[PDB]
Design a protein around this nucleic acid. Sequence first.
DNA 1: TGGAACCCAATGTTCT
DNA 2: AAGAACATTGGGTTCC
Lengths: 73, 72
Amino acid sequence: HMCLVCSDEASGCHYGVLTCGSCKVFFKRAVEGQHNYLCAGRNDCIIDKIRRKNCPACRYRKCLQAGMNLEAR
Amino acid sequence: HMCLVCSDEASGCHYGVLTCGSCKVFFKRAVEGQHNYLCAGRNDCIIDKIRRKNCPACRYRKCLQAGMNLEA
DNA sequence: TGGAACCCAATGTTCT
DNA sequence: AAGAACATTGGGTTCC
Ligand SMILES: [Zn+2]
Ligand SMILES: [Zn+2]
Ligand SMILES: [Zn+2]
Ligand SMILES: [Zn+2]
């Protein structure tokens, strides 16, 4: 299938969730770092393969929403 | 000293409009090179100092309609 | 599967 | 004013 956050081609199941590799490192980066991002829209940006980069705020919300956590295993 | 695009550090009329330096470069790059910018919202994103990075579609649109143009 | 370390794309600066 | 040229940040891929 495709990633459950961004719809790119998934690379397997990471931090609990079928994601592609990019969202994997992105989530890892967001959780261990700061993630104080601001949405420039209405906190419901569409996170597809190109737009992934537009809004880290919504991208991270979606990661959370889909269930990602560092302690999956 | 308020940029007509990202309402930031306004530094004189670039490409026909009072703009910051970062919006200066962005515009020439947007028109010159080819990328594809698509809005992830509603084609009305908030383009301010922190958030201008988030949506180049909307930033680019705000540029064009604030009068911006090269070979001015 | 999880993470390191490359590598790269875009932005924003300074300097001319 | 315009633009060459850095520097940097954030992102995404590669691990004969
Ligand atoms: Zn993804
Ligand atoms: Zn958003
Ligand atoms: Zn500006
Ligand atoms: Zn937008």
